[PDB]
Every structure is written in structure tokens, then in C-alpha cells.
Amino acid sequence: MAKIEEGKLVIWINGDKGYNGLAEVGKKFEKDTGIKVTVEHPDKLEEKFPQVAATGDGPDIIFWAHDRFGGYAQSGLLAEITPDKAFQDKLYPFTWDAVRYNGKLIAYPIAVEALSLIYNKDLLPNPPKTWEEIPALDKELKAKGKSALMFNLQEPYFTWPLIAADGGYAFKYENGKYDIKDVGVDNAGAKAGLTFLVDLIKNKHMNADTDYSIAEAAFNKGETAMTINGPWAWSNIDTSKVNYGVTVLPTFKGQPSKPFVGVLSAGINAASPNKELAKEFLENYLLTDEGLEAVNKDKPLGAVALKSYEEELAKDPRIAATMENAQKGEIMPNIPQMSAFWYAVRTAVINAASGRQTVDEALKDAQTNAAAEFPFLYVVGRKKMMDAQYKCYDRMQQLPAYQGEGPYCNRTWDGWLCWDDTPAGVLSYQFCPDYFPDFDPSEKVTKYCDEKGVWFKHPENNRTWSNYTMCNAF
């Protein structure tokens, strides 16, 4: 593991993406600026990031689908990103919305990721339009020593499009906000979709143990006629020389499969001492046609957020298909509870597929298994508080003595925030700090300078007390 260090960049990105191509963009950056860029692809980087960033470590830049980023931002772990409007206009507005959280942009969008149906044209010249036709197709193919369909059943990303087709969702959105009281698998549609999956397994058309590697090998060796995967998989299929197409996902009950669409995004660690370098790299090297092309040549990004390069990519029917599936899907929420949702659905699908639980039992436990994950979203780090403390005590030395007329309260560090000299009788205020994820930084903290130039003391212990109660009320 390369360490965070002023005057270089460390980047984390998932091992299924074009990390070698990204490193080439890094080399171009280093050539122009002298700044080394190191790209790493640790396992479970999306789980590891908050804990290592919380103690001031981690990468300068983290890449993942945008659904993880709200959790990181709510914990104060991501830098605000501040592109100019001319730069913003180069990317599709829906991609910016995916990375807008509590009013702020919290990452740069890179790629628009949707799963598609991938099929072997030699085994299956006309791919099925519906999930319901797959059992009969599998029977026909098994007579030839083949199967119809293999895809990853261990990660819920891959099974979600079927669950969502006829009514599955993560969280209800209403009156401008998500309602997290229920996960949207408590409906007949979600149940019907999962039941269809389980039935494919009971009827021996799929195996509950199939994972990404097993499915990939079977498709790329010509053993199964179809798989479900994203554009990052295409390189290996090209190598195999299977004559493949990429097409719309099958429908279920006449309704499109509805993949959860991820916007692969690059966040800047709040703890990085290289924030300006990271901005330069991302805006002026990576988010250009040349930069994205360098990544794409390693592993395909699929559809991208950058308009100029997407317009070129969309000449490829595989990319047009990726966008068709994306537009028939739903952009994932970015709220902190998405990780909870995913963990719950993961368990429900594995349990139902394997017969460890019935479909009804598995979907019922998804509600409480999601809620069980909520306290673990409380990840906090002390760095911001301590930087603010140091700044405060310095500024209290350097600012000239008070030049107003009358009794006033003295400049002070209250433990979480800095205050200036304040006239008697004034209720001073500032924004809530982003130290704790149950705090809303758009709410206000107040501190009352009483009638005599003395700061307000809490009556319960007669100690000087700033009022943070609006930060996490309700």
C-alpha cells in the first residue's frame, strides 16, 4: 500500500476497471507536472475507504459508483468539488446530479454503468426478449450440451434488474427526500422477480453458486449462450473470439429489466494535502477525450459522462445498448443507506437462491438486515476538528484587540468551533460542523453573549456552552 504524501497522488479504483490505462494518464500528468501518480486496486476498497480516511490516511482520489459517495460525504470524508460552469457543461447534467449531495458536488462523474444482456450469436442468433422464454431455451440448449444463461448470482447488482422489473426499488422518494422506513422489496413485483430467479435454479436452468468468475469462464468458452455483465467485461470476451452481441435485457411480465445504474465517479479525500493537484488531474487530464480513451483502451468504460467522447463511443452498438439499458433502469440513490440496502439484498438473494430461506422469509429479513447496518454508517474522523482547533488558537493570537465600544465576550474555541469577540446581548451564529454524520451542516449553531460581555453558560452545569441542538434535531 502506497501512502498519502504531499506532492504526489494515490488513486484507488476497482480491479475490474482499466487501472493500467488510468496509470498511463498518471504518467502523462507526471511528465507535464513532475507529480507522480500511483494507481492501486485494493480488494473491498469501497468498504475500506471510510475507515482509513477517518484517521487521515487512504488515497487522494477514490473511484466507485456514486451510490457509495453519500455515506462518505455524510461522514465529512470527501472534499467539495468546484468545477466551473464551462467544465460542468461538458458532462451530462444527470451525471452531476448523481454526485450532488446535500447541495454540494462530491465527485467527478466518469462513466455511466448499466448491465446488458450479452449473447453468443453462434449459439443464439435471436436472443430472447423475455425472461419467461429462457427455461424453454435452456431445455433446447441442454440437448446440445450447452445452457441458456449464466451470470453472477453472488452480488445483488446483477440480480437486481429482474427484482426491480415489476416493482422492486431501494427507497421511496417523495416531497424532495428519500423515506428510509422501508426497503422496496415488500411488494408483489419484487417477490415475483426473485421467485422467477429461484425457480430457474430449482428447475436446474441455473446454479445458486455461480459467481462472476464461473459465469465469465462459461460464456467465454462457449458453454452458455448468454450472460449479464457490464462493459468492463467486454475485453475478455473479445479475447475469447466468441461472436457476441450486447443487447437490451429481457423483460419480465412485459416490463423492462431495470438495472440500478451507477455513475463511476472520482472523489477527493477530505484529508488529502493534494486537493488542487487532484482537481487538475481529474479535470484537465482524465476528463478529456484523450484521458478517457487511455482508460477505455485498457478496459472499456462503456458509456461515459463526458459528452464529446460519449458521442464518439455511441457509434458502437454495444454502447447504444448500454445506454438503452441505463435509460430503462434507475440511477441509484446516493444516500448513506445504499450500502445497507445492498448488504440486505445480498443476503436475501443468496439465501433465497440457495434455499436457506423461502422468498417470503428472505425478503422479510431484508428490512431488518438493512436496518441492522445503520449504526455502522457512523464513521467519524478527528482531523477536521483538530485543524479547526489549531487555526482558532492561532487566529486568537494574531487578531488585533477589540476596537468596538462596550462590554463584549472574548474570542474562544468551544471544543468544536471558533468564535470571535462578540458584542453584549448578541446571539452569534455559524454553520454546524460536518464532524458527525447525524449533523446537518446547513443548520446553524448559536452562541449567546449575555448582557455583561460573558458567554452563556448551560444552567445544568454552569459551563460555557455553544448551542449545537439544531444540528441534529429530528
Binding site: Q74, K177, Y178, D179, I180, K181, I335, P336, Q337, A371, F374, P375, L377, Y378, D414, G415, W416, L417, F436, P437, D438, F439, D440, H458, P459, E460, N461, R463, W465, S466, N467, Y468, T469, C471, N472, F474
Partner: peptide, 17 residues
């Protein structure tokens, strides 16, 4: 239920800053 309400509740009473 709104997204901040699921988190453990940070103390803001007396004996905090």
C-alpha cells in the same frame, strides 16, 4: 424516516461543547 434519523445520536446537551 429521513436519512439522518437512522444514525446514532450525537450528544449536544450540557457537558458537550
Amino acid at each position: 424516516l429521513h436519512k439522518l434519523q437512522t444514525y446514532p445520536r450525537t450528544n449536544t446537551g450540557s457537558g458537550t461543547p
